Write a protein that binds this ligand. Structure first.
Ligand SMILES: Nc1nc2ccc(F)cc2s1
Length: 118
């Protein structure tokens, strides 16, 4: 009875503050853990710039834009895509950032998203 999408406000973290630098050790695990942390309100977002990904741990979980016409209630529609060793699991639009566990780091902003569940 999970609605297909959920409105979330994600804390945006600076990469050097992140204490837990990924969600796990395989593509399936990181997608599973990302979904669980999103559900629990314990997921942050790191915006990708030069130097960011080498400071985080693979596999990566990205949120990517899933369409261009609808940003309901100010929230960009996104979906999850994982990456390991240059191979991506899913295809989607432009990256908004990389998801990481949030364990109390102080954010620099919040990013409003409408996230596709499954
Ligand atoms: N299967 C599920 N994925 C998500 C992703 C995000 C969320 F908030 C809840 C759920 S339940």
């Amino acid at each position: 009875m999970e609605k297909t999408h959920v409105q979330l406000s994600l804390p945006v973290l600076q990469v050097r503050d992140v204490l837990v630098r990924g969600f796990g050790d395989s593509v399936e695990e990181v997608l599973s853990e990302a979904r669980q942390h999103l559900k629990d309100g314990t997921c942050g977002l790191v915006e990708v710039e030069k130097g960011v990904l080498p400071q985080l741990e693979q596999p990566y979980v990205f949120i990517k834009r899933s369409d261009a016409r609808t940003a309901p209630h100010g929230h960009v529609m996104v979906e999850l895509v994982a990456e390991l060793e240059g191979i991506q699991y899913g295809r989607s639009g432009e990256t908004l950032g990389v998801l990481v566990p949030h364990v109390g780091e102080i954010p620099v902003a919040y990013r409003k998203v409408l996230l596709r569940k499954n």
